[PDB]
Chain A
Amino acid sequence: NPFIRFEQDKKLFRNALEVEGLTKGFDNGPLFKNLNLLLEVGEKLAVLGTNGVGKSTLLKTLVGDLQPDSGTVKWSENARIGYYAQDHEYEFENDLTVFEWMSQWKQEGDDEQAVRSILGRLLFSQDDIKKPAKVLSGGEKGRMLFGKLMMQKPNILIMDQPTNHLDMESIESLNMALELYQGTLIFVSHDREFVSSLATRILEITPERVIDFSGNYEDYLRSKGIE
Chain B
Amino acid sequence: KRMRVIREKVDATKQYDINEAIALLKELATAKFVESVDVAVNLGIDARKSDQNVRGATVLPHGTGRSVRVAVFTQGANAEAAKAAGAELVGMEDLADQIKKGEMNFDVVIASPDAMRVVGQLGQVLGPRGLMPNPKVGTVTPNVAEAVKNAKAGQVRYRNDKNGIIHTTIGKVDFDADKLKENLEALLVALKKAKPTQAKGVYIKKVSISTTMGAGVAVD
Q: Do chains A and B touch in the complex (CB under 8 A)?
A: no
